[PDB]
C-alpha cells in the first residue's frame, strides 16, 4: 500500500497579504477527510501571516529555500532561524535555483544533509532538462542527482526525505508529464532507493511529481502505483489546489 | 550643514524570536532626541515580528535584499511583495551578494533602478577590495560602481538613494577604516555626484560609512564633514547600537 500522500504548494515569489488571506480562507474551509500531508510554502516574508491564518489541520508550512548556518549572509534565511520560528519543512534544489542561483548537485546534497541534521522534513527536487530527455539521459540524470543526496545521508535520515521528480520542461510550461512518463521515472527512482538504501526505506518513501499539475490531470497521475502526490506551482495559487489535494484520495 | 544622518542596522542572517524581542525592547526604550533616520534590516522571515514590536518613532524597517519582479523565483522576495507588507526600504549590492551570489555592477544598478521606480528608499552598497586598495584603485572602483548605478537613474530618483561606502576589507574583520580613510572616499564620491548629478543632489545625499563600526569609533567617524552616518553589521545586534545612533548627534 502507498505511504501517506503529500500535496505541496510552492507559491514561489507570489502573493499579497490580501490574496494570501483570501486563499488561506479557501484552504481552511476545505474539509479534508483522508490521510494526506498538505504543505504550503510561501515567500519568507509571508511565513508569519500564513502561520497566523492557516488553520486546516492537514497542513504544515514550508520554506522555499534555506542556507545551513546563520551568520554574515545578507539577504539569506538559515535553517536554525526557520526552526526557531516553527518552520520545520523546506524545499531544496528547486530547478531555477539549481540553474540560475548556482546550486550544484554537491551544494543541494549538502543543503539536504544539513536540513536533515537540523530535524527538517525535506522536499528535495530532482529532474532532467528537455535536452537531457531528448538525449535519453533521464534515468542517468535523476539517479545522479539522487545518489549525490544519498551520499551525504545516513539511512535513518531518509525518514525525513521526500523526493520531488520535477522535469524542467514541465515547470510552468503547460506541458505536464503524462502518467506513463511520470510513473516510469518514479518506478526507477524507487528501485534505486530499494537497492541502495533499503527495501523498508523504498516502501515508505514519498516520491512526488511536479510540473504543470492541475485539478484536471492530478487524479490520473495519482492512480499510478509509484506516485505519492504533487509539488504544485501555478495551480497552488488558486482554489483548484483543493481539487489536487482531493486527487490523492 | 549635513543632511539628516542615518544609523542603519544590517542584522544579516541572525536572530531568534527571543533575541529580537529583547533587542527591539532595548531599541524602543532608548529615547532619541535628535533628527536621525534609524533603520533595522532583519531577515525576511523576521520582518513581521519587527513590524509588530518595534515602536521607536525614529526607526523604519528595511529588507536586506530583493528582486525586482514577482513570479517563478523560488526562495526569493520581490519589491512589490515588500511594498505590500509595508517595507519601503531596501539594502542592495551588499558585498557578499556581489561576491558570491553573482550581483555584478549591472545587476546591482538594475536592482537599484527598479527599487527607485517602485518608491523604495535604497541603501546602495559600494566599496573596494583589499587588493583594489593596495593597487591604488579605490577611487576608480567606487566611482565605477556609483556611475553604473547613476546610469540607470533619473536625477529625481536620487532623493531616494543613500550610498553606503563599505570597503570589503573592513566588513566583520575588526579593522575599521580610519576617519581620514573614510572621509577621503566620501569627499571624492560627493564631488562626483556634484559634478555628474547636481550640486543640489550632492548637498542632500547621505553617504554612510560601513565596516567594523562600533560604539567607540562612531563619533570620530561622524565628526568628518562628508560622513552622514553608518551601515552597521555586528554591533547592530547588540545594545551598543544605541551609542552608534547617538554618535550621529
Ligand atoms: C514544482 C513546480 O516548480 C511546478 O510549477 P508549475 O507551475 O508547473 O506547477
Ligand atoms: C556593512 C557591514 O556589512 C558591516 O559589518 P560589520 O560587522 O563590519 O559592521
Short mmCIF file of C-alpha atoms in Angstrom, two decimals, chain A residues 65-174:
data_model
loop_
_atom_site.label_atom_id
_atom_site.label_comp_id
_atom_site.label_asym_id
_atom_site.label_seq_id
_atom_site.Cartn_x
_atom_site.Cartn_y
_atom_site.Cartn_z
CA UNK A 65 14.81 27.51 0.33
CA UNK A 66 17.35 27.98 3.14
CA UNK A 67 21.04 28.09 3.90
CA UNK A 68 22.51 25.75 6.53
CA UNK A 69 24.05 28.19 9.02
CA UNK A 70 23.36 31.64 10.46
CA UNK A 71 25.97 34.38 10.04
CA UNK A 72 27.12 37.16 7.71
CA UNK A 73 24.88 36.22 4.78
CA UNK A 74 22.91 39.35 3.87
CA UNK A 75 19.54 38.54 2.29
CA UNK A 76 19.55 34.85 3.23
CA UNK A 77 17.47 32.82 5.73
CA UNK A 78 19.11 29.98 7.67
CA UNK A 79 17.78 26.62 8.88
CA UNK A 80 18.21 27.46 12.59
CA UNK A 81 16.22 30.67 12.01
CA UNK A 82 13.35 28.72 10.36
CA UNK A 83 13.39 26.09 13.10
CA UNK A 84 13.15 28.78 15.78
CA UNK A 85 10.08 30.43 14.18
CA UNK A 86 8.43 27.00 13.88
CA UNK A 87 9.09 26.06 10.26
CA UNK A 88 10.45 22.51 10.03
CA UNK A 89 9.79 21.79 6.35
CA UNK A 90 11.94 23.07 3.48
CA UNK A 91 12.03 22.74 -0.30
CA UNK A 92 15.59 22.35 -1.62
CA UNK A 93 17.20 22.09 -5.05
CA UNK A 94 14.25 23.63 -6.90
CA UNK A 95 15.14 24.00 -10.59
CA UNK A 96 15.56 27.76 -11.13
CA UNK A 97 17.84 27.75 -8.04
CA UNK A 98 19.93 24.93 -9.49
CA UNK A 99 20.01 26.65 -12.89
CA UNK A 100 20.45 30.36 -12.06
CA UNK A 101 21.49 30.72 -8.41
CA UNK A 102 24.41 28.25 -8.63
CA UNK A 103 23.02 25.28 -6.67
CA UNK A 104 25.07 22.31 -7.97
CA UNK A 105 24.36 18.64 -7.12
CA UNK A 106 27.01 18.91 -4.38
CA UNK A 107 25.53 22.11 -2.95
CA UNK A 108 21.97 20.71 -3.00
CA UNK A 109 23.12 17.43 -1.38
CA UNK A 110 24.92 19.42 1.33
CA UNK A 111 21.82 21.56 1.99
CA UNK A 112 19.63 18.42 2.23
CA UNK A 113 22.10 16.79 4.64
CA UNK A 114 22.21 19.86 6.92
CA UNK A 115 18.41 20.18 6.88
CA UNK A 116 18.03 16.53 7.91
CA UNK A 117 20.60 17.04 10.69
CA UNK A 118 18.57 20.02 11.92
CA UNK A 119 15.38 17.93 12.03
CA UNK A 120 13.69 19.21 8.86
CA UNK A 121 11.32 17.35 6.62
CA UNK A 122 12.86 17.97 3.18
CA UNK A 123 11.27 18.11 -0.26
CA UNK A 124 14.34 17.51 -2.43
CA UNK A 125 13.78 18.41 -6.08
CA UNK A 126 15.27 16.37 -8.93
CA UNK A 127 14.65 16.26 -12.70
CA UNK A 128 16.08 16.35 -16.21
CA UNK A 129 16.12 19.15 -18.79
CA UNK A 130 14.44 18.97 -22.19
CA UNK A 131 17.82 18.32 -23.86
CA UNK A 132 18.69 15.61 -21.32
CA UNK A 133 15.38 13.83 -22.03
CA UNK A 134 15.90 14.07 -25.82
CA UNK A 135 19.35 12.51 -25.39
CA UNK A 136 17.76 9.64 -23.40
CA UNK A 137 19.61 10.72 -20.24
CA UNK A 138 16.58 11.00 -17.91
CA UNK A 139 17.48 7.93 -15.79
CA UNK A 140 21.18 8.82 -15.65
CA UNK A 141 20.36 12.40 -14.56
CA UNK A 142 17.78 11.73 -11.82
CA UNK A 143 19.82 8.80 -10.40
CA UNK A 144 22.94 11.03 -10.34
CA UNK A 145 21.02 13.77 -8.51
CA UNK A 146 19.53 11.24 -6.09
CA UNK A 147 22.85 9.47 -5.42
CA UNK A 148 24.56 12.83 -4.70
CA UNK A 149 21.95 13.47 -2.00
CA UNK A 150 22.13 9.86 -0.73
CA UNK A 151 25.94 10.05 -0.31
CA UNK A 152 25.52 12.66 2.45
CA UNK A 153 22.66 10.88 4.26
CA UNK A 154 22.54 8.18 6.92
CA UNK A 155 19.87 5.51 6.35
CA UNK A 156 17.75 6.89 9.20
CA UNK A 157 17.76 10.40 7.68
CA UNK A 158 15.58 9.12 4.80
CA UNK A 159 12.56 9.17 7.12
CA UNK A 160 12.77 12.97 6.71
CA UNK A 161 13.24 12.93 2.92
CA UNK A 162 10.59 13.46 0.25
CA UNK A 163 11.72 13.31 -3.38
CA UNK A 164 10.04 15.54 -5.95
CA UNK A 165 10.54 14.41 -9.53
CA UNK A 166 10.07 17.61 -11.48
CA UNK A 167 11.20 17.57 -15.12
CA UNK A 168 12.40 21.07 -16.00
CA UNK A 169 10.44 21.11 -19.27
CA UNK A 170 7.15 20.67 -17.34
CA UNK A 171 7.63 23.64 -14.95
CA UNK A 172 5.15 26.43 -15.82
CA UNK A 173 5.10 25.41 -19.48
CA UNK A 174 1.56 24.00 -19.60
#
